[PDB]
Amino acid sequence: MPLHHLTRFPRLEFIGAPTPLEYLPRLSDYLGREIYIKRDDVTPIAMGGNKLRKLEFLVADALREGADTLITAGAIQSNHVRQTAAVAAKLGLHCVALLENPIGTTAENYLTNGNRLLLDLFNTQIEMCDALTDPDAQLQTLATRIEAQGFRPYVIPVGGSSALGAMGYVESALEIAQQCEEVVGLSSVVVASGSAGTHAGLAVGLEHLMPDVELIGVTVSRSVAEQKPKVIALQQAIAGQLALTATADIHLWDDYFAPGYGVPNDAGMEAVKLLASLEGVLLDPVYTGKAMAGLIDGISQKRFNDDGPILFIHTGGAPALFAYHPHV
Amino acid sequence: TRFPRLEFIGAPTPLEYLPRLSDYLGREIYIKRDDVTPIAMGGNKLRKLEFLVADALREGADTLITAGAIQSNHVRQTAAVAAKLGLHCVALLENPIGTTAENYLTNGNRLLLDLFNTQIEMCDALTDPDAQLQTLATRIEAQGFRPYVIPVGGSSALGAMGYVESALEIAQQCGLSSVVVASGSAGTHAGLAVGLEHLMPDVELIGVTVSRSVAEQKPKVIALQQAIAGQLALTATADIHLWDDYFAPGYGVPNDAGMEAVKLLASLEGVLLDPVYTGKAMAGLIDGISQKRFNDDGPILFIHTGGAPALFAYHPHV
Ligand SMILES: [Cl-]
Secondary structure: OOOHHHHHOOOOOOOOOOOOEEEOHHHHHHHOOOEEEEEOOOOOOOOOOOHHHHHHHHHHHHHHOOOOEEEEEEEOOOHHHHHHHHHHHHOOOEEEEEEEOOOOOOOHHHHHOHHHHHHHHOOOEEEEOOOOOOHHHHHHHHHHHHHHOOOOEEEOOHHHOOHHHHHHHHHHHHHHHHHHOOOOOOOEEEEEEOOOHHHHHHHHHHHHHOOOOEEEEEEOOOOHHHHHHHHHHHHHHHHHHOOOOOOOOOEEEOOOOOOOOOOOOHHHHHHHHHHHHHHOOOOOOOOHHHHHHHHHHHHHOOOOOOOOOEEEEEOOOOHHHHHHOOOO | OOOOOOOOOOOOOOEEEOHHHHHHHOOOEEEEEOOOOOOOOOOOHHHHHHHHHHHHHHOOOOEEEEEEEOOOHHHHHHHHHHHHHOOEEEEEEEOOOOOOOHHHHHOHHHHHHHHOOOEEEEOOOOOOHHHHHHHHHHHHHOOOOOEEEOOHHHOOHHHHHHHHHHHHHHHHHOOOOEEEEEEOOOHHHHHHHHHHHOOOOOOEEEEEEOOOOHHHHHHHHHHHHHHHHHHOOOOOOOOOEEEOOOOOOOOOOOOHHHHHHHHHHHHHHOOOOOOOOHHHHHHHHHHHHHOOOOOOOOOEEEEEOOOOOHHHHHOOOO
16 A cells, blocks of 8 residues: 555566565574565566666656667676666667776686677677766766767666666565565565665565564675765655655675675685575675675574574576686 | 476476577478576476476486586486485486586586586496486495486487377467477477477477487387387377488587577577577478478477586687
8 A cells, every 4th residue: 555656657577576575494494483485586588687787767768758778887797787678679779888897807708708798799889987976977978988889878877776776676565575474574685786776676565564574785896884874765765656665674694705896705605505505506706795694694593583484586697607707 | 197207397487589590591380499497597307397396296306317418407407306305316417529628627517517516437438328227327326325317318108298298388478380309319309299299289390300310319219209108098199200400510519500500599589499409499490481491381389407516617719
């Protein structure tokens, strides 16, 4: 009932059915606590991912605006850029990508394999830059040039994280609440917290459908201090677009991303190895592996509110496994 | 329905209209998205494993053994399933193409095998898969384990039941004139053969071969077709159609027509095919239009059997 204004936003149909919400009996056995998993990694478009949920709203907005070109930005190994390019091809829209090498690697699989390989399969126009120091400003300059060629560009921010994009995860929260109804009482939810639209959309939805559930974001690029205002700003903007208040505090753990965004760490790689070997589930070195490492240590250090069921949001990211191998 | 089966997929996989590709080819093309399954990046082999692994549990196995190329999709899917169910996995692998390219040897499906904690046994060649798997099962059994052997490509009568099931989904989900599928170890072809004869008999089913000529491959598809039919107490009289022009110079080697099929589907539809199987099968479908090989001019159904992780293994070359 309280999420009905969500209906007013046009959206494309990229996913179809709700994504699986599954129990992880072997991980749970190992961790000594019930772990469930929301499989947003399993979507029908170009190897899937959370970003596709945001693109349903973003691209429908682009179509409504008469745009014929999608322009966005990210790392060379961005999942968002890859999903945006797959969607662009499918719809006969052009796609322009402003890419950066965030970790300064020269490893060939990072530079040419994984998500970056797929971009060429999608005929993505690639614009390289030294660094995304000011993505909104750099994306505009790029739009101006694209426009001078006669294209009608729609600019999507980094990670698809705008209030509109984040509606996709307000929607995901609705699925989660329905799937858990009379099946399991969730105590905590864990998701990776990057550009912040996924966290923020979950925050609004869960506040209204599942107010007792504790939502934890595991940062993948930022400290709590840098990250929290970004999540909050989106949270509030989302709530307003829906004519809702959002009074929930935002929780973030920043202990699991060192040495930095896009750099693998030992605990993140152990997390990937653990989910693959115990559950046949594929995480990634950049996002989900670090988030899972966060979940695992949280159980270990008693960081959660209690001993009840945890839901891990699988946001995707697996194509990056191939780019990060063998190293850097 | 007599055969016990594990639920790895659940919902029917999507069946879609490809309007951009259709527009380009001047023909109606549909796709069966069996590449979209929830387990370890998906694929057709998963449909087979629903039956083979159910069979394995019934016999109280604790270890699954199968064989394939280093970049085998089946082995990767078997290993993920094994990991999920708490079974050991032993894989017999060969290098079918004599490559030393780092990505073929260590990336793609092969990388996933390590993540899934697969035990790896290398052999010069899978000249006698049935017998080599048998030897492996013995040495594994003599170590205190209880092995269950899964054939190459998961292709046996039991395995192929997975594709009688897909045929039902196709029937439910569908003026279809033709169906195109890659024909390798043959369980998929033969499973769709049985299911489609009994549900869509007017539909022409074409297997595009990926490893063999029509002469070498037809008996394999037939043997399996007849076996599947017997097990379901049916008779299958429909003949097997195969095109073998699209796989040169051999199994697991990409060709230009297949790679350009991957490019066309990526750029037109945002769909990802692979260099070994579906790309080649799609090139056959396209050339089937070019040379008017199909029975008529009506809608074509392409079966996306999967294979995409091999894109990362085959890049940049060899
Ligand atoms: Cl334990």
